[PDB]
Amino acid sequence: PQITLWKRPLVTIRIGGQLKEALLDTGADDTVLEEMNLPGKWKPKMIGGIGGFIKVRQYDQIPVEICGHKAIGTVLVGPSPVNIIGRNLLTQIGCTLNF
Amino acid sequence: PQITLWKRPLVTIRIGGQLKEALLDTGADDTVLEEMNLPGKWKPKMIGGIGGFIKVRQYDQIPVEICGHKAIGTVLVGPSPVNIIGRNLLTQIGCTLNF
Numbered sequence A, B: 001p002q003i004t005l006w007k008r009p010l011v012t013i014r015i016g017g018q019l020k021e022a023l024l025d026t027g028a029d030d031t032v033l034e035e036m037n038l039p040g041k042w043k044p045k046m047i048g049g050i051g052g053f054i055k056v057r058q059y060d061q062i063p064v065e066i067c068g069h070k071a072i073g074t075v076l077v078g079p080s081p082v083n084i085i086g087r088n089l090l091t092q093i094g095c096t097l098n099f
């Protein structure tokens, strides 16, 4: 589809079979999720943006479906106010910026 | 242009007569530039990101040229590792997300 930027580009994703709302974020290298209790091994990581760094848990090879387009890769879980879909998964769904 | 996302969507902009590299960021509501001088009055403001809140200088009605496209709007100046072009300006240049 085509997603306009008049409002935050929030879309429904499925991860762990849960449905969530998440921000399509061309400025994010990573995919960062609101705290959720995913099973599996993880590695600690620190990621940064405006305001500083937060501690997150890195889970690998997690399926994430984005408006019906399937992806699989790394998701970082921790105390973010918003679920963010970053470039690692936006590339997998063939997302471009256009103007 | 059509811009893919296997690398950061960094483009050249012109602001205040100077060229800068900036990130095309669909996740950012606002446009936030690294600390610099701009002409005119500014007002103190605060904005929040993944790592928490920062103090910024708000400049209104600033012209910014983004890959040759003209925008004129609010630019926030503050401590950042990256010059970020947010939706307030992306929408002025007709930028959408597509997949």
Ligand SMILES: CC(C)(C)NC(=O)[C@@H]1C[C@@H]2CCCC[C@@H]2CN1C[C@@H](O)[C@H](Cc1ccccc1)NC(=O)[C@H](CC(N)=O)NC(=O)c1ccc2ccccc2n1
Pocket (backbone or CB within 6 Å): A025, A026, A027, A028, A029, A030, A031, A032, A047, A048, A049, A050, A080, A081, A082, A084, A086, B025, B026, B027, B028, B029, B030, B031, B032, B047, B048, B049, B050, B080, B081, B082, B084, B086
């Ligand atoms: C820019 C404003 C403040 C207007 N908005 C944001 O920061 C929004 C805020 C919402 C709500 C909180 C969670 C984050 C989301 C989306 N961000 C926008 C992002 O696109 C944001 C933009 C940004 C890029 C680079 C530096 C600072 C801000 N990106 C990130 O926060 C992500 C997190 C991540 N690791 O995926 N960051 C980066 O991609 C990144 C790249 C390079 C780099 C270099 C040095 C230091 C930090 C850093 N972060």
